[PDB]
């Protein structure tokens, strides 16, 4: 965890984000039960009948939040790990990681809370700043070693 | 592959899971051809006409299985790799990795086989146990290094 | 970046692919605005009214391209990283990585450009060759260390 001074910060923020995605998956399963909206007939028939094999607007929203996480956290997991080893200023580094962690946690709150536009979209942009900063840094760093 | 005693177990289980996802992608393409259900008009027009640009319940099921894999295996790939280096008891470690591998392989069998509830849901929960165990371990380990 | 001779090639191709996915996300947001097709009512109400909470065929296509990237680049990110450390012939290695990079960049061009079948499907198969080559190599390498 100490092979770079930035790596505990990265691993802390990264695993909190993975746990955070795990929390989104739990919430999705609870909305499915409460609105009785199942994607599979074998699920619906178990919970009351085939008419519960149906889509629901609130389940659809949960699925959109999880998908957006996969579009952003998974690249951060690669980028921040590699960036951790480009020996960033460990302050700047956890600033990157913390900005991303705080922005992504805020993103999920704005999506599932149905918060008015443009809250969700602002949080997405903030989180992408450290990632973009990290990807450019890694690119020059790798490019100049070719 | 030996920078930690847990790492061959992790890499073996991890790559089997990646190959397993690759197998799910192959199956999806075969259902699309057999039911003639294409997502894109350029695909449909190539296979018989625009009326084959259509959704199918069995293709939809394949897409749900692949998506659930992305929600779970990809975090395991990060978590199990990092956990491999927290020097777990290499028995416990491959127990984590094997429980996850066996549970996820069982999950895909239950989804695409249309197995009665709650088989698919039980397999998902078993696989998430080692991941949750791994994420908590990594969190304390990184937190205490900050 | 030099802990293996294959690793700069891998990191260069990998981050270009991550940036490439980031570009796909940007394009998706622009199609949503131009066709006025929003997935959330809080978004639609902000851009003209609830009738703009609607699906669009061109937004749907962008989402399919991003999803396919997640199915393929994310495993490459794991596989190519690990393969980088199995000390491949650094020529073969960047050949793997370059074939994947060039194939995946071509895949996105064929999807969003609505190119006639089977262009998109050919590019997907080319990119999967190095990944399959990498996964088999990692599997034997890890299996024989168990
Ligand atoms: N897949 C995204 C691409 C753009 C994006 O990620 N947008 C962010 C901010 S909204 C500009 C979001 O919250 N998208 C919400 C979502 O992906 O459901 C979309 O379909 O909007
Ligand atoms: N995205 C999931 C979140 C919960 C989940 O992963 N459920 C597992 C077990 S069923 C409780 C599953 O198999 N979900 C099936 C699927 O995701 O299609 C869902 O929409 O159900
Ligand atoms: N999820 C894919 C599985 C097969 C695949 O990846 N196909 C490639 C090549 S077409 C054979 C593709 O471009 N699929 C396009 C897409 O996934 O939208 C699908 O639903 O077709
Ligand atoms: C993990 C992130 C936590 C997200 C939980 C939801 C936040 C807002 C609470 C929802 C109130 C009304 C609904 O919609
Ligand atoms: C990789 C995992 C293999 C999944 C293959 C499908 C298993 C069940 C066979 C399907 C029989 C009927 C259908 O539905
Ligand atoms: C990143 C990959 C770039 C993809 C950009 C789109 C390529 C084709 C241009 C689209 C012209 C007509 C539409 O459809």
Author numbering:
A (entry chain A), B (entry chain A), C (entry chain A): 7 to 152
Give the article text:
The long-wavelength beamline I23 at Diamond Light Source overcomes these limitations and extends the accessible wavelength range to λ = 5.9 Å. In this study, we report the determination of diverse protein structures by experimental phasing techniques carried out at long wavelengths on beamline I23 at Diamond Light Source using S, Ca, K, Cl, V, I, Cd, and P as anomalous scatterers. Native-SAD uses light atoms naturally occurring in proteins or bound to proteins. We demonstrate that long-wavelength native-SAD has become a very compelling technique, where a low multiplicity dataset from a single crystal can be sufficient for successful structure determination, making it a general vehicle of choice for experimental phasing.
